[PDB]
Amino acid sequence: IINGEDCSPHSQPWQAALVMENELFCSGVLVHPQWVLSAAHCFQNSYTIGLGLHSLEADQEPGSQMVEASLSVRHPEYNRPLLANDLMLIKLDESVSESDTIRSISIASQCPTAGNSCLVSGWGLLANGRMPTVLQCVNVSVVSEEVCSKLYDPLYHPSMFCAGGGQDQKDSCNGDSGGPLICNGYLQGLVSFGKAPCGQVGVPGVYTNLCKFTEWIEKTVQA
Amino acid sequence: GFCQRSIPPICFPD
Ligand SMILES: [Li+]
């Protein structure tokens, strides 16, 4: 997260850390007690998932869990066309008893609208090029589909939307993939991709457009 | 110049 700050502890209780050999490679979002959304480009044969976390380095905070997940499924149209349909569902090996610090979030029932006020969180690269130990949070605003399609020429697809791009240079970055973009209090997007470098003036980040996938997600959950 | 924002990221010629 570029130009954010430490999140209030456990204020994003749906945040999931995806780690391998105890090293984060992506985030995800808890959407039901046994289901985590993430970017399809974060796909692995197995996962260790940190829930209820604030720090990655600290001793187990009260309420935190490290849970295994051995099953996941990418959207059948991931990367067709390139970069599009960037989502997958990870099924936890055990359902989590939701608690004060581990809670699912519901997906937005409206598609993104320019001007929407959002929050993105994650443990990805900071403005200073370092990785944080503590979960970072920053505000970004949705821009119009036409802005997104111009900026991400030639690869814009309706499974994507854009947020950020402000003169404030607030953005997601490497390591933030799969994490939540919360707009008006609902899960609106997952961090997906952007231009390198992250945090350029006039260049928003790209997020998976979850409102387009609610049917697929719930069909998969119920199957 | 586009990168999928995992760590390490997945970057493309554009
Ligand atoms: Li993992």
Author numbering:
A (entry chain A): 16 to 38, 40 to 67, 69 to 74, 74A, 75 to 125, 127 to 130, 132 to 147, 150 to 186, ...
B (entry chain B): 1 to 14
Q: What does the report in the manuscript say about this coordinate set?
A:
The kallikrein (KLK) gene family is the largest protease gene cluster in the human genome and encodes 15 serine proteases that have sequence identity varying from 40–80%, with a high degree of structural similarity around the active site1. KLK4 is predominantly expressed in basal and secretory cells of the prostate gland with lower levels of expression in a number of tissues including breast, ovaries, thyroid, testis and developing teeth. Over-expression of KLK4 has been documented in malignant prostate, ovarian and breast tumors and is associated with metastasis, and mechanisms underpinning resistance to androgen deprivation therapy. In order to investigate further both direct and indirect mechanisms of KLK4 inhibition here we describe the structures of KLK4 in complex with SFTI-1, an engineered SFTI-1 variant, and with nickel (KLK4-Ni).
To investigate the structural basis for increased potency, we solved the crystal structure of a KLK4-SFTI-1FCQR complex to 1.3 Å resolution. Compared with KLK4-SFTI-1 there is an overall increase in the buried surface area and number of protease-inhibitor interactions, consistent with the increased inhibitory potency of SFTI-1FCQR. Binding can be mainly attributed to improved interactions at mutated residues P4, P2 and P1. At the S4 site, the KLK4-SFTI-1FCQR structure shows conformational selection and/or induced fit upon binding, where the replacement of Arg at P4 with Phe is associated with a movement of loop VI towards the inhibitor, suggesting an improved interaction. Deep in the S2 pocket, the KLK4-SFTI-1FCQR structure shows an interaction between Gln4NE of SFTI-1FCQR and Tyr94O of KLK4. While there is still a requirement for hydrophobic interactions in the shallow of the S2 pocket, this observation provides a structural explanation for why the polarity of Gln is desirable in the S2 pocket, and goes some way to explaining the preference for Gln>Val>Leu>Thr at the S2 subsite previously reported. There are also several secondary effects that contribute to improved binding at unchanged SFTI-1 residues, notably P2′ and Phe12. This single, less-frustrated conformation was maintained throughout all simulations of KLK4 with SFTI-1FCQR.
